[PDB]
Amino acid sequence: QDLARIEQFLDALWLEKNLAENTLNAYRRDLSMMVEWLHHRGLTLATAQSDDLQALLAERLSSARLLSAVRRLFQYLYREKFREDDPSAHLKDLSEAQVERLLQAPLIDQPLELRDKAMLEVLYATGLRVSELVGLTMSDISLRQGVVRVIGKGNKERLVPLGEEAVYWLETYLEHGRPWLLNGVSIDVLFPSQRAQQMTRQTFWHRIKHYAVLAGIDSEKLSPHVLRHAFATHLLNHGADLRVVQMLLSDLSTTQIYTHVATERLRQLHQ
């Protein structure tokens, strides 16, 4: 479980078009010695303390690079809510109602905003990151299967079920939004800009602030992780399809919540 928690971190690290497979593998390395180390001491990703981390680092020494993987990972589990605190520091801002307003902000008769609605209902259901939503092509989607195909670090391709509501929005967007954004310009991009090009993480986070702002959320203080954790929690506390993933799941982590959700959904799909 903890070693998977490092693959999930590197994955999310690799998502932000950041670092390098080098610096990534230097992190896999450093963190895997670190969980070896910790597990040997009884400890776990969940319980290792700052003192435990201060020891490790002292156990010889590159201390810089090791400190870097440990601080990033430990900022990441804190951001994911995997743990309530960041043990490496020294070495949940959103209401249900604001999540409801934000998703209700986008004016679904303008093609642009119904793109933005569709992308938001995909974010809310699948747990994908903005980064993953933006490069999705017309080839990555199957509404009749109810799934979208996500590329990852490797050419790790997986299928994440969308659920009924996202399929619906995506449907309504393929009819009333996308086509009006393209005006017959062909692009494989599933969610193009209004000038029919690939949009980015940053160009869509602008749209998120504009929806956030209308929902009375502090726009300049919203972060991807508190959004992603507020969606996961709302979805979990409200979603239709995932009846008893609430009765089989506690101190919920973003990625653990969406992992469960994806497992129950793919289960229903293969049935």
From Swiss-Prot:
- GO MF entries: DNA binding; site-specific recombinase activity; tyrosine-based site-specific recombinase activity
A Pfam family assignment? Phage_int_SAM_1
Q: Which residues does the UniProt record annotate as the domain Core-binding (CB)?
A: 1-78
Summarize the activity regulation. Answer: During recombination, the heterotetrameric complex catalyzes two consecutive pairs of strand exchanges, implying that specific pairs of active sites are sequentially switched on and off in the recombinase tetramer to ensure that appropriate DNA strands will be exchanged at both reaction steps. FtsK plays a central role in this catalytic state switch that turns recombinase on and off reciprocally. The reciprocal C-terminal interaction between XerC and XerD may also participate in the enzymatic switch process.
Impact when changing Y258F: Abolishes DNA cleavage activity
Domain Tyr recombinase span(s) in chain numbering: 92-271
Subcellular localization: Cytoplasm
Q: What are the BP-aspect GO terms?
A: cell division; chromosome segregation; DNA recombination; DNA transposition; plasmid maintenance; resolution of DNA recombination intermediates; response to radiation
Q: What is the effect of changing R129K?
A: Abolishes DNA cleavage activity
Give the primary localization class: cytoplasm
Q: Say yes or no: keyword Cell division present.
A: yes
Cellular component aspect of the GO annotation: cytoplasm; Holliday junction resolvase complex
Record keywords: Cell cycle, Cell division, Chromosome partition, Cytoplasm, DNA integration, DNA recombination, DNA-binding
Keyword Cell division in annotation = yes
The residues responsible for catalysis, as annotated, are: R129, K153, H225, R228, Y258 (o-(3'-phospho-dna)-tyrosine intermediate)
Highest taxon listed in the record's lineage: Bacteria
| NCBIfam families from the UniProt entry | PRK00283.1 (NF001399), recomb_XerD (TIGR02225)
Alphabetical list of PANTHER family matching this protein: PHAGE INTEGRASE-RELATED, TYROSINE RECOMBINASE XERD
- Could you describe the subunit structure of this protein? Forms a cyclic heterotetrameric complex composed of two molecules of XerC and two molecules of XerD, in which XerC interacts with XerD via its C-terminal region, XerD interacts with XerC via its C-terminal region and so on.
Relate the protein's function as given in its record: Site-specific tyrosine recombinase, which acts by catalyzing the cutting and rejoining of the recombining DNA molecules. Binds cooperatively to specific DNA consensus sequences that are separated from XerC binding sites by a short central region, forming the heterotetrameric XerC-XerD complex that recombines DNA substrates. The complex is essential to convert dimers of the bacterial chromosome into monomers to permit their segregation at cell division. It also contributes to the segregational stability of plasmids at ColE1 xer (or cer) and pSC101 (or psi) sites.
Q: Which family does it belong to?
A: Belongs to the 'phage' integrase family. XerD subfamily.
Name recorded for this polypeptide: Tyrosine recombinase XerD
State the organism named in the record.
Escherichia coli (strain K12)
Gene (name only): xerD
